[PDB]
Amino acid sequence: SPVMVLENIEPEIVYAGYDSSKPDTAENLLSTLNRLAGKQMIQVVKWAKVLPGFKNLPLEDQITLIQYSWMSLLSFALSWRSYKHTNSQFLYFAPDLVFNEEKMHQSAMYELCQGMHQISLQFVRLQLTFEEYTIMKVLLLLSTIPKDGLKSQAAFEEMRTNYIKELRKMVTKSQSWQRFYQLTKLLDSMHDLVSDLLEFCFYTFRESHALKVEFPAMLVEIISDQLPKVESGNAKPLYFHRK
């Protein structure tokens, strides 16, 4: 039932609005990706609002969770689109913006694109299902909290524990303890990739005018809040299995 709701509330795919007549410089590609992320963030907010249990959390906590997890949610969904639409041969940012080796280099994000692509390759290896994917994406929204905890920490933990229980019930469909630990390992591995993506994001945000990289209002707001918190060590990534 909660998983059935997850399958039905999955946002529709959105276009990048990519102009292939313009030169494929890093500034043009990154500006297009940033505009696409802004549009996708509006969808994340609308999805989170109807996520079973999310409305029980206070408003300040809902905002904190979305601001800390945005990069993780966007990179996980990118890997799902890449896996579903290309069998993870390309980075499927949108139907009108599919990255091959050429675009990975032109974006000036080559190694970070390889890192995101490795998640897409893990989806092929595991033969990740849509049911597993939707629960795991909810767990990513609930994977980073403030160092001093949320306003309603107990309410958050109840919601998180319940989605971990849904993931454990779902793996039985594909012995199943082995699969559960392969999925929690994959969830944990998102923290390291996101840390690297955020380092690059923050750099382009601080030097936006110089690099000619544009940011939509939704990203300006999220990054302006997130950047000082992440850099000052206020973020607490939650791991299933500590390093």
Binding site: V45, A48, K49, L59, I63, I66, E221
Partner: peptide
């Protein structure tokens, strides 16, 4: 209100 506040409370 911020953009996230507006979107979450609408």
């Amino acid at each position: 209100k911020s953009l996230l506040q507006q979107l979450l409370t609408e």
